[model samples]
Target: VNSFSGYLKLTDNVYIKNADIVEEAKKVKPTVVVNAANVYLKHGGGVAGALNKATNNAMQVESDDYIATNGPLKVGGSCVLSGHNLAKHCLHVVGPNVNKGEDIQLLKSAYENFNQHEVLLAPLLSAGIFGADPIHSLRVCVDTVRTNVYLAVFDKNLYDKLVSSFL
Candidate 1:
């Protein structure tokens, strides 16, 4: 298993880590890894896709079953599904689409949803094809995520930003 390179404490329970979400997910039991999911919860690419692969496609299967049971998730909506490997669950959240303009509340809502889990490892939501700025995404994450939240970051640039911004 790979270890995180670094971390910065935000609160007693919240932290930012230069870590892979999938790796952290596997390293901790009773943890939920957040997916930067689309409204469709497709698990196609980016963090969603990576977590999907790491869970041996079980994430995708549960995602499909979720949408099949409920409708397509709307912006700011979230759902949790059981996971495999070591992570116990996956929390899927759909952040606002930046192309539609700056819907900051929706983005906040996405991060706010992380409160459901005491132990969470999440990526920067909407910072990929959804197009939210990474810096802004990071701020929202820091502001809204609650206890035992680990903002797992894989990109070197983002890792640097996290370190520079906090310490």
Candidate 2:
């Protein structure tokens, strides 16, 4: 059986495998980790999702801060929300079901948060959950973020894209 702590290493590849998400996270030393669990599901809840719900719920009854539920937003599934833990705020993007236009919307939401001085920790782009090709995901992420804003990601593929974009 896999435990959250067991999979926290950068070498563990937690995104492809569900086992050890939290464990892999600790290794990265992320300022804040985003959890993509379902809100309706009980055991699927992770720290990032929990924090988003707690903070967003406190602000408004129906704010974007809460985890997404229904359709593609189902927990423990591919179709889900993209959330991040930022120094100033927690950003969550409720994603659509289909692959088309999904990355565009996600990038737009991420950019909005970035403009607000929030560090965007997007999972779909890094995880390729949005069904976009690796290159496309990287392009969208780089294009969305401003020059001044520092973007951080756990996935090496994404990191490589960032490197290639400038070079």
Candidate 3:
């Protein structure tokens, strides 16, 4: 048998990684893929765009009502969508859009709303387009989450930085 290190393990099968999200997702196929969305659940840019690419065109309807009554699933809120192709579920959350500036507290709040599950594919939250550096926001996801949490990343620099930061 083989094993991995640096994950806060709750179970043998559960772990989070700053690894190849798309590549591994294709291999095992997640039960769900999480999206770090805006308060509006807008899928126009950044992590939202990547999630759209993964799940095809089925990221809205299920989110409408959830967003309406909720008033932008901000910190301390989230929504899941189904009836879509690819993964069986899609979790949408706003990890404090850092596009304006560096915000780490929002990440903590956003993270608390997380629901534990099996086989979930996610990115580095609101690290990139949202403004916060990938290394920092990703650390929050890494520290708290305990499951099949995949912080799938495509950037070599991100991967290197993540490794250097802790590993």
Cα TM-score per model: 0.86, 0.40, 0.75
How much is 74 displaced in model 3, in angstroms? Answer: 1.7
lDDT tens per residue, model 2, 1-167: 22223222221122122323233343443333344322232221334444445444342232333334333242222322222222233333333323544434454454333344333233433234434455554455455545222233445665555455542
Using lDDT as the measure, the top candidate is: 1
Which residue pairs in model 1 clash with each other? none
lDDT of 1: 0.77
lDDT of each: 0.77, 0.36, 0.63
Q: Cα lDDT of model 3 overall?
A: 0.63
Q: For candidate 2, what's the RMSD?
A: 10.5
Tens-digit lDDT string for candidate 1 (121-145): 7788888677878878887777777
lDDT of 3 by residue, 32-141 (tens): 76776787877776767655666564566556666687777655457777625646677777776655664568786676555466456677777777777776776676
Q: What are the clashing pairs of model 2?
A: 4-23, 7-24, 8-23, 8-24, 9-24, 72-79
Model 3 poorest ten-residue lDDT run: 1-10
Query: Ten-residue segment with the worst summed lDDT in candidate 2?
Result: 6-15
Ranking by TM-score: 1, 3, 2
